[PDB]
Write the structure tokens for this entry.
Amino acid sequence: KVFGRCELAAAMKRHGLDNYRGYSLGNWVCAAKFESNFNTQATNRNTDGSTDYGILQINSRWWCNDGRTPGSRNLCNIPCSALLSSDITASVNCAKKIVSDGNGMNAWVAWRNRCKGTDVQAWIRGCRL
Ligand SMILES: [Cl-]
Ligand SMILES: [Cl-]
Ligand SMILES: [Cl-]
Ligand SMILES: [Cl-]
Ligand code: NA
Ligand SMILES: [Ru+3]
């Protein structure tokens, strides 16, 4: 599914991400924009052989199992394919664990490089939330 900006904001809110670990909804929307362009089916191979999956480009090296990432973990206890679903529940639940891991949203390099410190509230501007 390719979400609209306010559609995804609404879904993330409904799923408990608004201010999760102190990160306003705009931060989550901004991260999703630059990780996946709001596309739940987004996949990208990393140089290390791992693959990132979904709306929030969660990595197969720690967080989900894809059967092809040697020496990896599956800390979210899910198949990476669950992260490509139109239903964002699995991605949100796993992102909750990632952002709680110690470095907050810096775990998402594109959040750090493109969202951090910016006017992230722009991302939820005009949404009925
Ligand atoms: Cl915000
Ligand atoms: Cl699996
Ligand atoms: Cl959903
Ligand atoms: Cl933090
Ligand atoms: Na894995
Ligand atoms: Ru839902």
